[PDB]
């Protein structure tokens, strides 16, 4: 149950809250206060999902859907079967995401490593708050949030986009997609570069840091370097949501027209009209 190098690292300490109370492992898993609160929010949320689903038309995993209230409930509570389950499940999701993040902090501290991972993980958490909390607050109803259903969430995304005629022209979305695309390509390049160095093939010798830099110097005339590509990777991945969030928040509260029309700022300048 322990990696052969693991025991020396399995020391006491590093917590944010709780100290020795929850400072232990269950199998490979560190617990900690935030492990305990994670488990709690997860159990609660999954139980509410199962129960809510049981009251609905289907057990098919793809078609199950737990939906927020009608717009007219604004920011108040809704009957359980009319959005209330959705409200409670959202609160549990947040609790679980935030615990998971804070637990990652404790794990980092115990290992004497940077806190860069939980910090990165704040980005999708923040994105979730944009969709489910901040935009609905700005619009005045919980009902603008997305439903919990594997395919139904996509119907929401779909309708949300077409409410603005063509969502592809949303500058936040263009930015977001560009970062998604370049990030996916860069992860391929980074993974392939490293593998190509450690696995030349045919009994050949493993290459070097110098070969690494030579490769991209040759192919594109520049090489960012070994540490920097990791900083770059984090920056590109992060900016998928950090810029996408602006496009999401803008739609409704800061723009009610179709997105293509927004580009009128450029097209309609009197000079070239």
């Amino acid at each position: 149950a322990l990696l052969s190098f693991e025991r020396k690292y399995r020391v006491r300490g590093g917590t944010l809250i709780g100290g020795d109370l929850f400072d232990f492992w269950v199998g490979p898993y560190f617990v900690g206060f935030f492990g305990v609160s994670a488990i709690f929010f997860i159990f609660l949320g999954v139980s509410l999902i199962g129960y809510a689903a049981s009251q609905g038309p289907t057990w098919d995993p793809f078609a199950i859907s737990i939906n927020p209230p009608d717009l007219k409930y604004g920011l108040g509570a809704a009957p359980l079967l009319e959005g209330g389950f959705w409200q409670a499940i959202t609160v549990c999701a947040l609790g679980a995401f935030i615990s998971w993040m804070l637990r990652e902090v404790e794990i980092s501290r115990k290992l004497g490593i940077g806190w860069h991972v939980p910090l990165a993980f704040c980005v999708p958490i923040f994105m979730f708050c944009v969709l489910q909390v901040f935009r609905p607050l700005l619009l005045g109803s919980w009902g603008h949030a997305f439903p919990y259903g594997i395919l139904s969430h996509l119907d929401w995304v779909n309708n949300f986009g077409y409410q603005y005629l063509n969502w592809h022209y949303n500058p936040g979305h263009m930015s977001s997609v560009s970062f998604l695309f370049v990030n996916a390509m860069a992860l391929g390049l980074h993974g392939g570069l490293i593998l190509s160095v450690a696995n030349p093939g045919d009994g050949d010798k493993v290459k070097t840091a110098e070969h690494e830099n030579q490769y991209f110097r040759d192919v594109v005339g520049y090489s960012i370097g070994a540490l920097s590509i990791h900083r770059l990777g984090l920056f590109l991945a992060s900016n998928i949501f950090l810029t996408g969030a602006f496009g999401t928040i803008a739609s409704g509260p800061f723009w009610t027209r179709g997105w293509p029309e927004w580009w009128g700022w450029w097209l309609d300048i009197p000079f070239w009209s």
């Binding site: 009608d70 005045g140 109803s141 077409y162 005629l165 009610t256 179709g258 293509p260």
Partner: protein
């Protein structure tokens, strides 16, 4: 750049589907003010004396009306169509029976068109109905018309830049974009779908798998048809100042039942109505109009959704004059 909050939002679909209208209050307000310029109904007059078919010399459409009723109609017509030009726009001041002036015969046709709309297209216009004002808004030339090529500005009351002019070839893409809510879709959905009944708007297969015999090579509609339908839908949306979810659940554009709102059925009737108006009332008017009214291919200006709706989901927010002017339809 942006529109400051709050946004007015409605719900047109089951909760959680992000379906409904998204409106900017200042814009809504401005449109209400423009549309509240609709002249009030004229005071009612009692039917009295003989029908104007006996009294006047050249009445072909409104013959059942009494003198006072008829002259009331003419007053409304003037308020609606040519309030700045007055009665003599259509009339020879010395011979009210004369058809010498082109607007006169055009207006008689328009009277038939208007009664046809209110009598035969109630599936669209319901008991709200239309008057000359609905399209004309107080000018002989309605502010929103289409030719057989895209024209800018959309509102012909605004002065065109040199690039907007239909003769400036470098301005074509922009003329096309602004008719399709600024998209780059390379199709004019007016000539394709609204001028006449030649083309089919639907493009989505009605089965999961491709039917052998309609799905290979030249048997297929080209993908251009799907861009074109998208163009039309962008244009319809902009014409009613709404978005796709006013009519559709985007889960499945092609489906009716729970997947479409009653507004979509009404829109479908509207396409049929527009094509009727265009093919049967408006296009044939090129024989009766001065050359200067015609498009570069000799066409008369025609109607689209914007012609009536002018950026609102019901024209003039649902204002009606139907019971005030029964002579405009429905005709028993």
């Amino acid at each position: 750049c942006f529109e400051p909050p709050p946004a007015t939002t409605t719900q047109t679909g089951f909760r959680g589907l992000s379906m409904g209208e998204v409106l900017h209050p200042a814009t809504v307000k401005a449109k209400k003010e423009r549309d509240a310029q609709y002249p009030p109904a004229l005071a009612a007059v009692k039917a009295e004396g003989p029908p104007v078919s006996q009294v006047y010399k050249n009445v072909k459409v409104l013959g059942n009306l009494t003198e006072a009723e008829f002259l009331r109609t003419m007053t409304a017509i003037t308020e609606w169509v040519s309030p700045q030009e007055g009665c003599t726009y259509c009339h020879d001041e010395n011979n009210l029976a004369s058809e010498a002036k082109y607007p006169y015969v055009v207006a008689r046709r328009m009277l038939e068109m208007t009664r046809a709309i209110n009598t035969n297209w109630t599936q669209h216009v319901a008991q709200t109905g239309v008057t000359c004002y609905t399209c004309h808004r107080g000018t002989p030339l309605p502010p929103y018309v289409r030719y057989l090529e895209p024209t800018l500005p959309l509102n012909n009351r605004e002065t065109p830049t040199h690039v907007e002019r239909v003769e400036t070839r470098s301005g074509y893409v922009v003329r096309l974009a602004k008719y399709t809510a600024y998209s780059a879709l390379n199709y004019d959905p007016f000539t394709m779908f609204l001028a006449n009944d030649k083309r089919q708007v639907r493009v989505v297969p009605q089965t999961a798998l491709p039917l052998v015999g309609v799905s290979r090579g030249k048997e297929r509609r080209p993908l251009s048809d799907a861009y074109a339908t998208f163009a039309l839908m962008m244009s319809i949306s902009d014409s009613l100042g709404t978005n796709c979810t006013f009519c559709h659940n985007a889960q499945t554009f092609e489906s009716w039942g729970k997947k479409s709102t009653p507004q979509r059925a009404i829109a479908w009737w509207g396409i049929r109505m527009v094509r009727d108006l265009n093919m049967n009332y408006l296009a044939p008017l090129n024989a009766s109009l001065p050359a200067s009214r015609l498009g570069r291919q000799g066409e008369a200006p025609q109607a689209d959704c914007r012609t009536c709706h002018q950026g609102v989901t019901k024209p003039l927010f649902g204002a009606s004059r139907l019971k005030d002017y029964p002579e405009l339809g429905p005709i028993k």
